[PDB]
Amino acid sequence: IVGGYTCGANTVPYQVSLNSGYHFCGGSLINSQWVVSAAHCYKSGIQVRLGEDNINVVEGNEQFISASKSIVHPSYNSNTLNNDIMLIKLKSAASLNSRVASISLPTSCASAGTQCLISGWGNTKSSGTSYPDVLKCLKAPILSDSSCKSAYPGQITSNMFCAGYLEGGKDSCQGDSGGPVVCSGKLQGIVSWGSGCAQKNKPGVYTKVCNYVSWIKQTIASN
Ligand SMILES: [Ca+2]
């Protein structure tokens, strides 16, 4: 997250870190056994880390649970990043509490102008490189479909939306991939892609989660 703030320990209790010897992506806990992330975060050997603030220090609220299975969306295209969504099942159910909690799926899509919370352990620099170890947060509005498409000619599908600031300065970044965009207590987006970070007229692009609720529910119901 570039131009954000330190969230505070366990203030984003649905935020997970995906770890394969190191943090490589964010995710969102949606029930005791399932995490939603980006399809471009897919790999084998995933451990899901819940209750994290400092990802380099065991602070006492963590739960480390290995993934038993991953399910990339059937229509995911890695070239265009269309349908950039994946489900990860935990080998055991997480113990839910005030600091490890599921985030509700949307019942309807959120509109341009809706204020949301984007969070992650990604790069905090738009030019250089600096990885924070504590969770960073950004309050950002959803942008209009028209402004999103104008920012990225030929690249915005019906399964994507832009959020952030056309002036730049505040954005998601490398390492935030797969993490949450939460608006009015609902998971509306997944950190998916952008062109650099916090650049003028290049806001972050997010997977439009409301399009996938039926797939998420049906997949969970049979796996
Ligand atoms: Ca920790």
UniProtKB/Swiss-Prot annotation:
Active site residues of this protein: 40, 84, 177
Keywords: Calcium, Digestion, Disulfide bond, Hydrolase, Metal-binding, Protease, Secreted, Serine protease, Signal, Zymogen
Residues that hold substrate according to the record: 171-172, 174-175, 177
Modification note: Subsequent cleavage after Lys-125 leads to alpha-trypsin. Further cleavage after Lys-170 yields pseudotrypsin. A cleavage may also occur after Arg-99. Not sulfated on tyrosine residue(s).
Species annotation: Bos taurus
Pfam families: Trypsin
InterPro entries listed in its UniProt record: Peptidase_S1_PA, Peptidase_S1_PA_chymotrypsin, Peptidase_S1A, Serine_Proteases_S1, Trypsin_dom, TRYPSIN_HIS, TRYPSIN_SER
CC cofactor note: Binds 1 Ca(2+) ion per subunit.
Disulfide bonds: 7-137, 25-41, 109-210, 116-183, 148-162, 173-197
Activity regulation statement: Is inhibited by scorpion cyclotide trypsin inhibitor TopI1.
Similarity section: Belongs to the peptidase S1 family.
Alphabetized GO MF terms: endopeptidase activity; metal ion binding; serine-type endopeptidase activity; serpin family protein binding
Top-level EC class as recorded in UniProt: hydrolase
Swiss-Prot/TrEMBL cofactor(s): Ca(2+)
Tissue: Synthesized in the acinar cells of the pancreas.
Annotated Ca(2+) binding sites: 52, 54, 57, 62
Source species, domain of life: Eukaryota
Biological processes per GO annotation: digestion; proteolysis
PANTHER family in UniProt: RIKEN CDNA 2210010C04 GENE, TRYPSIN-RELATED
GO cellular component assignments: extracellular space; serine protease inhibitor complex
Subunit text: Interacts with SERPINA1.
Domain Peptidase S1: from-to ranges: 1-221
Reaction it catalyzes: Preferential cleavage: Arg-|-Xaa, Lys-|-Xaa
Name under which the protein is recorded: Serine protease 1
